[PDB]
Write a protein that binds this ligand. Structure first.
Ligand SMILES: [Ca+2]
Length: 221
């Protein structure tokens, strides 16, 4: 049924974890459909972000996005910060990635920010998942409109990925998160369709703490 097609496409995403050297993406071809021109080897877009909005404060978002272009074999993007719940207060700090190092291309307003960039690791570089069918009490959702679909699982605080996130980020909640897998576009795949995952620590009306990651192969601009 649709649940098995949803699990299958999501398992294909989980399989990328980990890719510890980002340069390996220069030599990885993802799913190709008719939206790619014959001459375009594609671009991998990697995006990791941590969102922390504690009760009664601003929703602070910090993350990075890299465009790993297989045609140029060069990688550019930015580190971003937002304090808004496109984001109307986003500040982007440009970077490049060479030999698996993140290098700012303009000076930073302060050292804390320069060090966060320099030491940055995308969740694809260190995450590692089980087979999707090994996660426990999954709510699988399917909407034919887009179509869009999701798979939601409850994790435990001793889960390897949860521990890695708590090591690398100061996450102000003790709660074990949900693993939320999200996708849209034809189930077989689409260069225009999305795939993302989320570790949802807290989700309510006045407090939101979550981490999002996406690693996607797309046609180059
Ligand atoms: Ca896609």
């Amino acid at each position: 049924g649709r649940n098995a097609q949803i699990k299958d496409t999501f398992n294909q995403t989980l399989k990328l974890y980990p890719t510890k050297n980002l340069d390996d993406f220069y030599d990885k071809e993802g799913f190709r459909d008719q939206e790619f021109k014959k001459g375009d080897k594609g671009t991998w877009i990697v995006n990791s972000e941590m969102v922390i909005e504690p009760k009664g404060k601003d929703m602070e978002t910090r993350g990075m996005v890299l465009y790993i272009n297989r045609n140029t074999r060069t990688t550019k993007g930015y580190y971003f910060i937002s304090e808004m719940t496109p984001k109307d207060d986003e500040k982007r700090y440009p970077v490049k990635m060479e030999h698996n190092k993140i290098i700012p291309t303009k000076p930073l307003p302060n050292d804390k920010l320069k060090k966060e960039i320099e030491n940055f690791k995308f969740f694809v570089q260190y995450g590692n998942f089980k087979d999707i069918n090994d996660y426990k009490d999954g709510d699988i959702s399917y909407n034919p409109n887009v179509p869009s679909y999701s798979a939601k699982y409850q994790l435990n605080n001793d889960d390897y990925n949860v521990q890695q996130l708590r090591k690398r980020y100061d996450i102000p909640t003790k709660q074990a998160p949900k693993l939320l897998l999200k996708g849209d576009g034809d189930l077989k795949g689409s260069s225009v369709g999305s795939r993302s995952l989320e570790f949802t620590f807290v989700e309510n009306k006045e407090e939101n703490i979550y981490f999002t990651d996406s690693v996607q192969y797309t046609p180059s601009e």
